Design a protein around this ligand. Structure first.
Ligand SMILES: C=C(C)[C@]12C[C@@H](C)[C@@]34O[C@](Cc5ccccc5)(O[C@@H]1[C@@H]3C=C(COC(=O)Cc1ccc(O)c(OC)c1)C[C@]1(O)C(=O)C(C)=C[C@@H]41)O2
Ligand SMILES: CCCCCCCCCCCCC(=O)O[C@@H](COC(=O)CCC)COP(=O)(O)O[C@H]1[C@H](O)[C@@H](O)[C@@H](O)[C@@H](O)[C@@H]1O
Lengths: 537, 80, 79, 67, 80
């Protein structure tokens, strides 16, 4: 075999398999070729910065990834040296992990990778009934299902989660089972082991806490069993708790608002508590407001520690947590200034108050139309308002500088006032004759008319047109993102749960088949879905 | 959504104002509302400290409601 | 005609430079009109910052659409 | 705007190419590293016995059919 | 602006003796589904006068497909 680090471990058998030459594969196996030889050179790894082809480093995984079923069957079922179907590479990946890796959610790729996946699963069952390949974890601790969920390989999940195998002695491999079928109507059962809950890598957890770089993190939840499961979890357990939380937050903001509104106007905090009812309630509301701010502060820190965003995931995603945390930061700064005998504690407080009210929109999730509306607002702010505001600020600043240069020894005669006065045009309040302290009236009026045409006429209507184009395209994206926000809310609720409640675990310990490879019966927590079809009678 | 934004910024601004002509949720609410109809004064008072905070709040309100939310409403009505 | 229908950006940069030079000539010509040219150049300069939005996929498309709008829709509407 | 999306993408790429060409043509430093892609041998078999080095540019591609 | 002809030329590959040298696209290695092609690039990047990039980029704006021609695979990747 090769000894260089670039092609390390490549041997003749890899070549014969790779070239799709059955005869040489047979001859090499006959001559005692090692079917476990690991091709672990740099060329046979992921290695994004260099060319290569990762296939799990083993001959069996190679034949599998290359859509050579005959070679797979031979490698497992040859006379001279059968292959170890459970074999793992340096990463710990089995064949199935490799099949997940090579998937890219394209049609032909998904078709053949799914077919090969099914075939290898059947062969694994028939050769080794006690062996459970899918349960095997790599060095990352991921089962092939968990790997597929994390990597965004939607097609593989679309196969696995509703996998149904119609033959004797392979029924127990199915994850979808049909209990009864009367007429066009039949009741299916989806397994959902390690979807709802498990030790570490529940599929819902893996999707929801994805790193924002997974391609299809929005699309994956559309696969029927997950979507129905989330809807059931919502309706049964989480809707009420979420509404209660929203109510509590409304109470919090009302208390904060009342406490801030009735602040005293004297100088130099802290202020002596007067022995009267109004002030006792005031200081009470102040204390509760500060307490809630601290609560959100520590929730934000807990989020940061639990997820550990890497300084880009900290900003490109998870905006809600950042906004709530920033509000709490402003509250704490308000406290520090208050007890430091600085009147600037007002300045912080209002900012927190303002953000608090806007953060109320966080609870629009859980309501179908309103959460979508909130998501579209988020996307609009991130794309269209950012681009527009940059360009508009360029225009505003350029013309402000020109005009304030033209103005000399007037009331305005300064960048701040001129910028404000030009900005008044955008809100339909520009005076257009706001000063005469200049020479060259024609130049001044030309500048203002140019600014007005470029900003008020052209740019704003352009912004409207672009927003109209944007909403035309982000409808289904908005639907997926709202469903995802609902999902993460559900998972947080069930994970916190504050009561040691087990009722969150749904779907009932039902028996699917009753016939394992041994005589034992299998209870698999299946979730029931009824469906009607007027074809295939 | 607009009423949440309006109320929130009205509360912030009226808190910031002290012993002024407005100094009251109703007048401030109307005054911020006037921006939506293209009549926002934007300098309707000086009875505060921290001018920068005041103007920053008004600018944020204008951008969020007048610039973003209304044009978003137009776009959504176009889709509908 | 190719002098105008394309190379919009080069024309604008050139005009900025022209206004700067005219401002200089009027400055040393002992004329106070140099202010009038100068500010135009200044205004033009800041606007031409949008030239550099190109090389960004998101902003450059926006700037391109500004150019197309000015040529077609704004001109028709203003007439 | 509904009718000039794709036109806009092509214009974006186009004038970015303009920027590239002006940069390499001006270059202000007599730099030869701008001439990229390496002097590779394509065939090595011209009509005569000589070998041809033609400054090729590498592009790696992946296809799931025509094995 | 004859974009079709460029689409033919810039990725021209001829598999026979005494005609491979005419090819501008050559296949170096192909392991499984992956393979590395080599595009010739003579008179694209640079030449005496009429480098293809110079001709396209400095087109007269009346060339039909001046927006489209740079979508041709080797040119777009080279520019990137
Ligand atoms: C089309 C021509 C060359 C033009 C050149 C000048 C005089 C200009 O006035 C116009 C006429 C005009 C006047 C008032 C309102 C609209 C248009 O529009 C532009 C031109 C109009 C603009 C347009 O700004 C832009 O094009 C941004 C831009 C987009 C794409 C680009 O590739 C670009 O390269 C710099 C710049 C800005 C001005 O130069 C400017 O800032 C001043 C003070 C007047 C504008 O003449
Ligand atoms: C002075 C006053 C200033 C107020 C400034 C702020 C006003 C807007 C406040 C509106 C409240 C909206 C909200 O509450 O949240 C919005 C955040 O709005 C912004 O964009 C802030 C722009 C900065 C979405 O936050 P979200 O947590 O859902 O992020 C999503 C992920 O969770 C999800 O899983 C997906 O990964 C998705 O890709 C992510 O987006």
């Amino acid at each position: 075999s090769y000894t260089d680090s670039y092609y390390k471990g490549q041997t003749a058998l890899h070549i014969a398999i790779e070239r799709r030459n059955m005869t040489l594969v047979t001859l090499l196996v006959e001559n005692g070729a090692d079917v476990q030889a690991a091709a672990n050179g740099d060329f046979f790894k992921k290695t994004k910065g260099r060319p290569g082809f990762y296939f799990g480093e083993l001959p069996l995984s190679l034949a599998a990834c290359t859509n050579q079923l005959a070679i797979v069957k031979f490698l497992l079922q040859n006379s001279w040296q059968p292959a170890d179907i459970s074999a793992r590479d340096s990463v710990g990946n089995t064949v199935l992990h490799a099949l997940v890796e090579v998937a890219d959610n394209t049609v032909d790729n998904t078709k053949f990778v799914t077919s090969m996946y099914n075939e290898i699963l059947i062969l694994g069952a028939k050769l080794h009934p006690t062996l459970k390949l899918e349960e095997i974890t790599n060095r990352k601790g991921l089962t092939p299902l968990a790997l597929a969920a994390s990597s965004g390989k939607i097609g593989v999940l679309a196969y696995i989660l509703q996998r149904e195998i119609h033959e004797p002695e392979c029924r127990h491999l199915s994850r979808k089972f049909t209990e009864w079928a009367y007429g066009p109507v039949h009741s299916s059962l989806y397994d959902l082991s390690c979807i709802d809950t498990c030790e570490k890598n529940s599929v819902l957890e893996v999707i929801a806490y994805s790193s924002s770089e997974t391609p299809n993190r929005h699309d994956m939840l559309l696969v029927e069993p997950l979507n129905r499961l989330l809807q059931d979890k919502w309706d049964r357990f989480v809707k009420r708790i979420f509404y209660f939380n929203f109510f509590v937050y409304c109470l919090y903001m009302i208390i904060f608002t009342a406490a801030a509104y009735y602040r005293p106007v004297e100088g130099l905090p802290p202020y002596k508590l007067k022995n009267t009812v109004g002030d006792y309630f005031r200081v009470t509301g102040e204390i509760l407001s500060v307490s809630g701010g601290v609560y959100f502060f520590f929730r934000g820190i807990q989020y940061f520690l639990q997820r550990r965003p890497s300084l880009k995931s900290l900003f490109v995603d998870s905006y809600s947590e950042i906004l709530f945390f920033v509000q709490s930061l402003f509250m704490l700064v308000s406290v520090v200034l208050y007890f430091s005998q600085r009147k600037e504690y007002v300045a912080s407080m209002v900012f927190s108050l303002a953000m608090g009210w806007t953060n109320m929109l966080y609870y629009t999730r859980g309501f179908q139309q309103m959460g979508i509306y909130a998501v579209m607002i988020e996307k609009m702010i991130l794309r269209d308002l950012c681009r527009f505001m940059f360009v508009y600020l360029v225009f505003l600043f350029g013309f402000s500088t020109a005009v304030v240069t033209l103005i000399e020894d007037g009331k305005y005669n300064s960048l701040y006032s001129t910028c404000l006065e030009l900005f008044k045009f955008t809100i339909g309040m520009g005076d257009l004759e706001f000063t005469e302290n200049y020479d060259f009236k024609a130049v001044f009026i030309i500048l203002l008319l140019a600014y007005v045409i470029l900003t008020y006429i052209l740019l704003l209507n352009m912004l409207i047109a672009l927003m109209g184009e944007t909403v035309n395209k982000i409808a289904q994206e908005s639907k997926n993102i709202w469903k995802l926000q609902r999902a993460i809310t559900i998972l947080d609720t069930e994970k916190s749960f504050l009561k040691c409640m087990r009722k969150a675990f749904r779907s009932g310990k039902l028996l699917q088949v009753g016939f394992t490879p041994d005589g034992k019966d299998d209870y698999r927590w299946c979730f029931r879905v009824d469906e009607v079809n007027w074809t295939t009678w």
